[PDB]
Swiss-Prot record:
The PAF1 complex is a multifunctional complex. Involved in transcription initiation via genetic interactions with TATA-binding proteins. Involved in elongation. It regulates 3'-end formation of snR47 by modulating the recruitment or stable association of NRD1 and NAB3 with RNA polymerase II. Also has a role in transcription-coupled histone modification. Required for activation of RAD6 ubiquitin conjugate and the BRE1 ubiquitin ligase which ubiquitinate 'Lys-126' histone H2B. This is RNA polymerase-associated protein RTF1. It is found in: Nucleus, Nucleoplasm. The lineage of its organism: Eukaryota, Fungi, Dikarya, Ascomycota, Saccharomycotina. Present with 6510 molecules/cell in log phase SD medium.
Protein backbone atom coordinates (compact mmCIF):
# COMPACT_ATOMS: atom_id res chain seq x y z
CA UNK A 1 0.00 0.00 0.00
CA UNK A 2 1.28 3.40 -1.15
CA UNK A 3 0.59 6.59 0.79
CA UNK A 4 -1.82 9.08 -0.74
CA UNK A 5 0.32 12.17 -1.41
CA UNK A 6 -2.59 14.65 -1.23
CA UNK A 7 -5.17 13.21 1.16
CA UNK A 8 -6.89 16.56 1.86
CA UNK A 9 -9.62 17.17 -0.73
CA UNK A 10 -7.56 15.25 -3.27
CA UNK A 11 -5.11 18.10 -3.82
CA UNK A 12 -3.57 19.25 -0.49
CA UNK A 13 -1.18 17.59 1.97
CA UNK A 14 -2.77 19.11 5.09
CA UNK A 15 -4.26 22.44 6.21
CA UNK A 16 -1.07 24.52 6.19
CA UNK A 17 -0.34 23.29 2.66
CA UNK A 18 -3.87 24.28 1.64
CA UNK A 19 -3.44 27.75 3.16
CA UNK A 20 -0.09 28.14 1.41
CA UNK A 21 -1.39 27.19 -2.04
CA UNK A 22 -4.46 29.36 -1.56
CA UNK A 23 -2.17 32.32 -0.79
CA UNK A 24 -0.17 32.00 -4.02
CA UNK A 25 -0.75 33.99 -7.20
CA UNK A 26 -3.20 32.38 -9.62
CA UNK A 27 -0.61 31.18 -12.15
CA UNK A 28 1.54 29.49 -9.51
CA UNK A 29 -1.46 27.93 -7.75
CA UNK A 30 -2.99 26.54 -10.95
CA UNK A 31 0.41 25.20 -12.05
CA UNK A 32 0.92 23.35 -8.77
CA UNK A 33 -2.65 21.99 -8.86
CA UNK A 34 -2.00 20.69 -12.38
CA UNK A 35 1.24 19.06 -11.21
CA UNK A 36 -0.63 17.46 -8.32
CA UNK A 37 -3.44 16.20 -10.55
CA UNK A 38 -0.80 14.30 -12.54
CA UNK A 39 0.74 12.85 -9.38
CA UNK A 40 -2.72 11.78 -8.19
CA UNK A 41 -3.61 10.12 -11.51
CA UNK A 42 -0.43 8.03 -11.31
CA UNK A 43 -1.12 7.22 -7.64
CA UNK A 44 -4.67 6.12 -8.46
CA UNK A 45 -3.54 4.11 -11.48
CA UNK A 46 -1.02 2.21 -9.32
CA UNK A 47 -3.70 1.63 -6.69
CA UNK A 48 -6.04 0.20 -9.33
CA UNK A 49 -3.33 -2.12 -10.64
CA UNK A 50 -2.58 -3.31 -7.09
CA UNK A 51 -6.27 -4.13 -6.57
CA UNK A 52 -6.34 -6.11 -9.84
CA UNK A 53 -3.22 -8.09 -8.93
CA UNK A 54 -4.85 -9.46 -5.79
NA1 LIG B 1 -6.79 25.64 6.19
Amino acid sequence: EEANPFPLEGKYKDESDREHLESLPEMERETLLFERSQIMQKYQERKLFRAAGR
